[PDB]
Design a protein around this ligand. Structure first.
Ligand SMILES: *[C@@H]1O[C@H](CO)[C@@H](O[C@@H]2O[C@H](CO)[C@@H](O)[C@H](O)[C@H]2NC(C)=O)[C@H](O)[C@H]1NC(C)=O
Ligand SMILES: *[C@@H]1O[C@H](CO)[C@@H](O[C@@H]2O[C@H](CO)[C@@H](O)[C@H](O)[C@H]2NC(C)=O)[C@H](O)[C@H]1NC(C)=O
Ligand code: NAG
Ligand code: NAG
Ligand code: NAG
Ligand code: NAG
Ligand code: NAG
Ligand code: NAG
Ligand code: NAG
Lengths: 49, 248, 360, 120, 49
């Protein structure tokens, strides 16, 4: 049971770490989307592209 | 009683392509709409499968069992009746006998004194073994059985369990997909390294009816099996055959 | 306790998990058919002599030892090397039933390490003997007023028997220096003597029918099992199930799946057992897992109030001021049709606030 | 298994760490949706006579015929996207996010950029 | 062999985790570089600094 617990706990920690990295990426994308919503939809932007 | 057959015609055994045959259900587990990867004893796709004919040709050699055996039978009139498994095929060791005579299917595990050329011969003449001294297991089961019938069998001997997988198809080998359903789980617990099939003669000397059988050997490999909504295997992928299937 | 503080701020806090405990235990296995032939061994009309003791091998059937234990005429049940209680659980590869007839005084010689005429010359047991002996009186069956001379024992032999050895020879015993030459004269005796049973002998000389069960386990896949008791089948509740040695806990419901005849249990997308076929009645049952929920507590500040609401995440309200949300079942809040700004987020458009605790 | 849980207790606060991290991610997703879509505190509505100088916004304005109150483009977008583990629902439903997009579209069509910097 | 496999597997998972974190940092820097290429090279920017 100690072997099964350590293996499953390591798997769960790996999953949570992957979720944190993906959450950081999605947070960055959401921050970009909020910036686009403010600057492209709520105003006219002179920023190229 | 044993009879030597001296009227054979010398010819080398043929070889042909396995195509996508020899697939069986790996376990007793239902699966629906999923793809499952198994590392089991399987027959490779498009492999070199040995071809024997019965036509004056009477092909009954004794072949090594290896790790598993795929037997294909393009049969009409039920000439092929059974198989013999063992190590030395005598009273020194213990052997397994599978027969289907005119009435019932008999499975025996005994120390048979086998004939060099065992065969079957209304059917009223049985010349398979001369003696059976120590019988440890008996099992009586249901009848298993232009060319009209394709009979596919897979024999495995893993962990002392002898697995027989079977499929019947109304019909060289045809090109198509047919999954072999598990038929018999046999508790023998004996060593098997060599096998020989049993034929039936027709007497009017003797004449051989038109039949063909194929012998293939199993190797450890992974297959990707496709299960439909009804749990029937419809397609398979051999992961080690070609790069496209490896990608699949 | 979860936040390690005596003051809790306003918000929703996930605190524990909700599990539906098992209500009953269900044990299932196949129908008890294809019984072994212990009736042909024990309830036979005629037994063999002890020198030519009958050996019956028992394979590929179900062996019910509970019949032998529960019969009161079978007086002697001396079992060595294995307990009689755990015979129904322990599985063996082959069962050897050695059957013979002896007298009353020689019942004790059917044991490991014993000696006498029966142990040396008729039936020898090994010291490492795994199996039980069964003996019962048969004065009504095996005795006649004239006397029954159909039972023989070997009185003389040149050497003792090996364990589980049968000696059926009728060679004239060599007790003297001169050769016997097959004639039972001086110092030459016929080695087999007759037990002359009569119905008027004492308990030490009445005929006793003895059946010795020897259990062996080999490298073959053991097939002589005990009868496997099946508990009656309970559906629609979260119960423990034991289907053919597959253990688990789940709600059993009727299934629409069309299993193939070989197929017994079914696996889902994630390879967990989601369907099973009952071994006795060939029907398919889905095994939904017992309800699991995240127990979250919605509370305002402890400075303001001590009222709390409980959210069971992903749990229907019928299986736990009760309101059903997509997030789960909310207990302790009253839904208000009025819409306000979100104060405590619940989910799926539902938010909670304190004004009592309301959900909107 | 109760014995497994008893053995698991010896390892400390790993379970609490994992739950806390997942809870942080879960609240972060709702915060992300709130930041992107809830940028207006007034729900603007388009006039009933949807004539804007020859400009057609039918493909982006909400469809009254549809129960979800989504635009044809939004409906197309939703159509084209398809054990101890639980999935928590998002705080903002698809209908409310669609309502926020509708409010932003109504503000940007009827008021230009004025609504983003103050009154519409 | 198990002790060696779990140690090496832990090392490899650690390496992949730092690679993913560095990938996120480099992706952020690349996104900034693409923004600079669009707004400084392909147009004139009124953003200070
Ligand atoms: C059929 O032919 C086989 C092959 O020669 C015979 O098998 C041999 O028989 C001799 C008889 O003296 C034995 O010494 C050999 O050991 C046998 N060979 C093997 C491999 O077992 C067989 O006896 C023939 N059948 C009959 C009925 O004579
Ligand atoms: C605005 O655009 C929509 C869609 O492009 C126009 O609706 C179409 O109208 C014609 C004739 O009236 C129909 O044949 C099409 O099937 C309509 N398409 C859809 C998707 O509804 C609409 O006419 C345009 N003008 C106005 C004033 O709304
Ligand atoms: C099958 O094996 C035979 C000899 O065993 C060989 O001659 C033949 O070429 C093989 N088949 C193929 C397709 O290579
Ligand atoms: C088939 O074999 C079984 C087993 O030996 C036997 O009992 C039966 O009589 C056989 N059938 C015929 C027709 O001889
Ligand atoms: C096998 O048979 C031979 C002769 O029939 C006998 O001597 C031997 O004891 C037997 N062995 C077993 C294990 O039954
Ligand atoms: C089976 O027999 C073969 C040869 O007869 C031998 O090489 C092999 O080791 C045996 N296997 C077992 C499991 O006894
Ligand atoms: C699956 O079974 C249903 C009825 O049980 C049948 O209508 C359907 O055609 C089957 N599907 C396949 C692929 O055979
Ligand atoms: C099992 O036995 C019961 C009788 O108790 C019977 O109703 C049922 O049909 C049997 N099932 C099978 C598969 O034989
Ligand atoms: C023998 O007969 C008795 C008498 O009813 C019965 O109880 C028992 O089950 C039978 N079989 C055996 C093996 O004792």
């Amino acid at each position: 049971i100690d072997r099964l617990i350590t293996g499953r706990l390591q798997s769960l920690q790996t999953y949570v770490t992957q979720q944190l990295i993906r959450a950081a990426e999605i947070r960055a994308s959401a921050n970009l989307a909020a910036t686009k919503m403010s600057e492209c939809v709520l105003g006219q932007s002179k920023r190229v592209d | 009683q044993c009879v030597n057959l001296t009227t054979r015609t010398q010819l080398p055994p043929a070889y042909t392509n396995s195509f996508t045959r020899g697939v069986y259900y790996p376990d007793k587990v239902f699966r629906s709409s999923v793809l499952h990867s198994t590392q089991d004893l399987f027959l490779p796709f498009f492999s070199n499968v040995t071809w024997f004919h019965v036509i004056k040709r009477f092909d009954n050699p004794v072949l090594p069992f290896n790790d598993g055996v795929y037997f294909a039978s393009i049969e009409k009139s039920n000439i092929i009746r059974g198989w013999i498994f063992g190590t030395t095929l005598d009273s020194k060791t213990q052997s397994l006998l599978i027969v289907n005579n005119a009435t019932n299917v008999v499975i025996k595990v005994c120390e048979f004194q086998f004939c060099n050329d065992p065969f079957l011969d209304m059917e009223s003449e049985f010349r398979v073994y001369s003696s059976a001294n120590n019988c440890t297991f008996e099992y009586v089961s249901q009848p298993f059985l232009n060319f009209k019938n394709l009979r596919e069998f897979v024999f495995k001997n893993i962990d002392g369990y002898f697995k027989i997988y079977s499929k019947h198809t109304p019909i060289d080998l045809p090109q198509g997909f047919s999954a072999l359903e598990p038929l018999v789980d046999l508790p023998i617990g004996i060593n098997i390294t060599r096998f020989q099939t049993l034929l039936a003669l027709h007497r009017s000397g003797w004449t051989a009816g038109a039949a063909a059988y194929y012998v293939g050997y199993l190797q450890p490999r992974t297959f990707l099996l496709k299960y439909n909504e009804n749990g029937t295997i419809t397609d398979a992928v051999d992961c080690a055959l070609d790069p496209l299937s490896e990608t699949k | 306790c979860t936040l390690k503080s005596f003051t809790v701020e306003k918000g929703i806090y996930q605190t524990s998990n909700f599990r539906v405990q098992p209500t009953e235990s269900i044990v299932r296995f196949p129908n008890i058919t294809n019984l072994c032939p212990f009736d042909e061994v024990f309830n036979a009309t005629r037994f063999a002599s002890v020198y030519a003791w009958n050996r019956k091998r028992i394979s590929n059937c179900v062996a019910d030892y509970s019949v032998l234990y529960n019969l009161a005429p079978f007086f002697t049940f001396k079992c060595y090397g294995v307990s009689p209680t755990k015979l129904n659980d322990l599985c063996f590869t082959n069962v050897y039933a050695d059957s013979f007839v002896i007298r009353g005084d020689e019942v004790r010689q059917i044991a490991p390490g014993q000696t006498g005429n029966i142990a040396d010359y008729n039936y020898k047991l090994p010291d490492d003997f795994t199996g039980c002996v069964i003996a019962w009186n048969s004065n009504k069956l095996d005795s006649k007023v004239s006397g029954n001379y159909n039972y023989l024992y070997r009185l003389f032999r040149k050497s003792n028997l090996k364990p589980f050895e049968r000696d059926i020879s009728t060679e004239i015993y060599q007790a003297g220096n001169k050769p016997c030459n097959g004639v039972a004269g001086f110092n030459c005796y016929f080695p087999l003597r007759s037990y002359s049973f009569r119905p008027t002998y004492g308990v030490g000389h009445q005929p006793y029918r003895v059946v010795v069960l020897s259990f062996e386990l080999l490298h073959a896949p053991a097939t002589v099992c005990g009868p496997k008791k099946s508990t009656n089948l309970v559906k629609n509740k979260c119960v423990n199930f034991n289907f053919n040695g597959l253990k688990g806990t789940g709600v059993l419901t009727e299934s629409n799946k069309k299993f193939l005849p070989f197929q017994q249990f079914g696996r889902d997308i994630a390879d967990t057992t989601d369907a099973v076929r009952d071994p006795q009645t060939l029907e398919i049952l889905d095994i939904t897992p017992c309800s699991f929920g995240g127990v979250s507590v919605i509370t305002p500040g402890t400075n303001t109030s001590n009222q709390v609401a409980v959210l069971y995440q992903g749990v229907n309200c019928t299986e736990v001021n009760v309101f059903q949300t997509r997030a789960g079942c909310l207990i302790g809040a009253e839904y208000v049709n009025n819409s306000y700004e979100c104060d405590i987020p619940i989910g799926a458009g539902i938010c909670a606030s304190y004004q009592s605790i309301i959900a909107y | 298994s109760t014995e497994c849980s008893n053995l698991l207790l010896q390892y400390g606060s790993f379970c609490t760490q994992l739950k806390r991290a997942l809870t942080g991610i879960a609240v972060e997703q709702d915060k992300n949706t709130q930041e992107v879509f809830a940028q207006v505190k007034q729900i603007y509505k388009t006039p009933p006579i949807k004539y804007f100088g020859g400009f057609n916004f039918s493909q982006i304005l909400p469809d009254p015929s549809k129960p979800s109150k989504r635009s044809p483009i939004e409906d197309l977008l939703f159509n084209k996207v398809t054990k101890g583990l639980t999935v928590l629902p998002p705080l903002l439903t698809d209908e409310m996010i669609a309502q926020y997009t509708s409010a932003l579209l109504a503000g940007t069509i009827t008021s230009g950029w004025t609504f983003g910097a103050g009154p519409a």
